[PDB]
């Protein structure tokens, strides 16, 4: 088979992640169409409909019945390389696959860096305000 870390490349696996997805039959953003777009379901108490791309790790919420997951992706973050692969997974060469997976590993790092950066700016804002308050 294929080891877990690589399962997200499998459409059927992505589909599987949508448990209690509200947008079903009749909707443009079905679990099938979401998966075809590269999304997996990453629900939180806070954001129950939160989906994330497995490749570029971009995250979208506030989904609506008529949303085309593909056009949503292309619109909010076009740079994602998964979008550009029209080949079927198993028609891919191992070189092509490992190439992609390299870029995913890259994207992942980028994602984590941007996150560290955001919480840095957040704690900064807090020390700043505290300092201001004391100054008063």
């Amino acid at each position: 088979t294929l080891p877990p870390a690589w399962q997200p490349f499998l459409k059927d696996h992505r589909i599987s992640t949508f448990k209690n997805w509200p947008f079903l039959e009749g909707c443009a953003c079905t679990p099938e169409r979401m998966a075809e777009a590269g999304f997996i379901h990453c629900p939180t108490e806070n954001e129950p409909d939160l989906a994330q791309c497995f490749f570029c790790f971009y995250e979208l919420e506030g989904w609506e019945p008529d949303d085309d997951p593909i056009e949503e992706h292309k619109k909010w973050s076009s740079g994602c390389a998964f979008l550009s692969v029209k080949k079927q997974f198993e028609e891919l060469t191992l070189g092509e696959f490992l190439k992609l997976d390299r870029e995913r590993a890259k994207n992942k790092i980028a994602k984590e860096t941007n996150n560290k950066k955001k919480e840095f700016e957040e704690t900064a804002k807090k020390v700043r305000r505290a300092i201001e308050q004391l100054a008063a």
Partner: peptide
């Protein structure tokens, strides 16, 4: 949809 929209970013978070």
């Amino acid at each position: 949809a929209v970013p978070i």
